[PDB]
Amino acid sequence: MRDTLVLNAFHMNTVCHMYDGGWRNPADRQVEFATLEFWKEVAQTLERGFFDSLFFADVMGTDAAYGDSWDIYAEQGIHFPMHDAASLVAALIPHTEHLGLTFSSSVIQDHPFSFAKRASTLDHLSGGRVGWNIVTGGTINASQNFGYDSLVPHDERYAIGEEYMEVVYKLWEGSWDEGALVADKTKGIYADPSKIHKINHRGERYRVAGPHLTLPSPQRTPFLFQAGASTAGRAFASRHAEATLVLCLTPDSMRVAYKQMQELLAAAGRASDDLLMVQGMSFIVGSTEEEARRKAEEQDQYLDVDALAARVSRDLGVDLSKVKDLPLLYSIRIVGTPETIADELTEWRDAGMGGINMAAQMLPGTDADFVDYVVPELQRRGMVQHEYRPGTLREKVFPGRDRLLNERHPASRYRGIFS
Amino acid sequence: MRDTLVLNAFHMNTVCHMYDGGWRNPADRQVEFATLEFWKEVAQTLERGFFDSLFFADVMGTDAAYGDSWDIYAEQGIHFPMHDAASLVAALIPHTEHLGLTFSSSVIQDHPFSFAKRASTLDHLSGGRVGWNIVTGGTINASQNFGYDSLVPHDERYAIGEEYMEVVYKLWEGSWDEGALVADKTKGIYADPSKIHKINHRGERYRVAGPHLTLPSPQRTPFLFQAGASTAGRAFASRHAEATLVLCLTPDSMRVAYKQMQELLAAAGRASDDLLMVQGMSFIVGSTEEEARRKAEEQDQYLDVDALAARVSRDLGVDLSKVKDLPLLYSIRIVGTPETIADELTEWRDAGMGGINMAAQMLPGTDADFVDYVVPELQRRGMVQHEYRPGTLREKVFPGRDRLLNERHPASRYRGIFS
Ligand SMILES: Cc1cc2nc3c(=O)[nH]c(=O)nc-3n(C[C@H](O)[C@H](O)[C@H](O)COP(=O)(O)O)c2cc1C
Ligand SMILES: Cc1cc2nc3c(=O)[nH]c(=O)nc-3n(C[C@H](O)[C@H](O)[C@H](O)COP(=O)(O)O)c2cc1C
């Protein structure tokens, strides 16, 4: 029932999230990420653009995969410093109203009881606007920061993933049954103890008693993002995610990738339309074609090649010591007019793109310019919403639907198992 | 030279924090705790009173210990449901300007890397206003909420304690040496990497590489609350705290307890000013003495005693089968006129009380009544600040001190130990 694209901002609580070395640009303001105010302006611009969500990536780590000198990662600010996403999201509740506030928490960096209790809390406080990107790995230092030798092997990471989701759904959906809150002052019953349960979860990595500590929140289980490119991962996204964060290079790469997920969803026991493919992207924009080309010139100066190699050389492994196109493994940039950019996005949406996962070259410039110039174009073509729909982030992304996840979704299956 | 009293509100992100059963009062609104708007009004009323801080308690478990079943903890809201204070402190940042925002986190609930990184992040975002009530405790359920058969014994909680603090101080004070941020775009250096170090902490319960992930923050180490009333604990608070939350039953009790701390502090290597004995209390005011006694009748109707017993029992092991003066275990009540409540609070201050730790019987009433009636009287008498002093919460509690902690404080030991 949703004929308009989903817009999602893809930022991270660090000086330079995307287009490495781009913190140098005199016109930039990302060096301000430490303050609440910088981000308020970015949050608000986006809600002037009717963006469905703003998403904060997050790491517990920094590593020297380039050569053997961790130098350039502090010198060019490559995902270091890293500040805590969750904390900032709470800090943005008051300076937004309908904007979805999303974040990565990983599996290693917070116990699912703690992570469950925090999510529920934010979900209450935000008024049902919380997004959760499920992360299952993290780098070496990430492990060595919570005292672990080395990484647990790739696919075990997703095994562990499943139990984490086993635990949180139990807490969010299972522990409190419907009608548990009573709030009857005269009768003297706040919460109905016959409807509030332990989980007594006992598995291979997690034991947890419960009950879950929070009142049921507006969404119960926050709006679920996952970004798994691999087999064990894509599988996981197909199983649990409401929107997967993906990076196809051509629209024909999206068409393949869409078809693939559709099969995976059917095996996972879910509808074609239960999951949005959301594309990593970025934009530069102008009135003429020449203004936008000439913007990219300006912005691409401050693009450091050696620090782009430092983020590639961690991921791929290969220690590279055209090459300038490599930020196309992180977002497909589109330069041009609003008409051009809209024209090109139509190909992607036709290839199966359900949403844009928009990153920034400069902040708040990219974000401003996309809202200022592109959003009205897309709104005119009926591709981007004119106004917010009322209700929870789930209710927004999936128009017909209930504030709670569908009966097809793994979460639903926990609803009153312990009744 | 801090010559006014500290005011700390002592609330908790739950329906009935403090005068058990009191959620039932038709005048009360603590049943609205789940929403940000209730707490926005509580926070703002406190800042209008010039409170130094608002403090959120937090447990990570409810327990069975009241005989047959766990029913009376649901029905009468006995520190259940329980919502995460961290998140709420972050969501009040925008609705407050100078008010200090404090929370209990415990050892058991969060690893000292994550917790360090969340704190420092909250501390940037707040702008130097974060408090940290250190908790080494835990009810049995909270242990079983993280996969542990039973409690570790009392002595060891504080041992584990001192390591956790040994880890967090390493990250907050040790890793990033002064002049670490550079931010020079012309030059192209975000952080001097010679000044950013792994902590390489390998102790009893913990291993952590670091480095810490956040830019050094205004306070660096958040402002430190501690509550340990036992041997191990006082000794712990004497060693690490800036303000200890205590429960002295009588001013004679404070005079003794204050004397004791000053020996513990001297042994702990600290000057006598370096920590504040902040007292648990609760006021009911009126314009005559008959007005305030009349209020105290009206509220105490709704004071449940069996529920009170059930919280006493959670803490002291034994399930029960005057008794209405068991609430002197949690806060000392004063009813009367503002003349009375200032006259009486002088005695406490003269016996060594450096701040009040004010809990609510109703909200927003108890706080509003204290702010509207008592505060003006204390400001007359030079007992309570007229106007917020600029700088951090450290700088607000200790006039003319640095934003950072003193060289007499354990945290300082860690400054520089890696270059
Ligand atoms: C758009 C996007 C955002 C991501 N954000 C994070 C993050 O915030 N934290 C993190 O540890 N990993 C992050 N990742 C890495 C993913 O969790 C994922 O593990 C990776 O893309 C490959 O998944 P796989 O586990 O299927 O190999 C992100 C990936 C993508 C594509
Ligand atoms: C004012 C006050 C607030 C407290 N808040 C919390 C809290 O939020 N969470 C928690 O687990 N324990 C809390 N406690 C429990 C303390 O850990 C308690 O003082 C206990 O006695 C620790 O000292 P001990 O271990 O020496 O007995 C609090 C105690 C006091 C006095």
From TrEMBL, chains A, B:
Keywords: Flavoprotein, FMN, Nucleotide-binding
Top-rank lineage group of the source organism: Bacteria
Amino-acid positions noted as binding FMN in the UniProt annotation, renumbered to this chain: D58, S104, Y158, A227, A229, S230
Record protein name field: Hexachlorobenzene oxidative dehalogenase
Record organism: Nocardioides sp. PD653
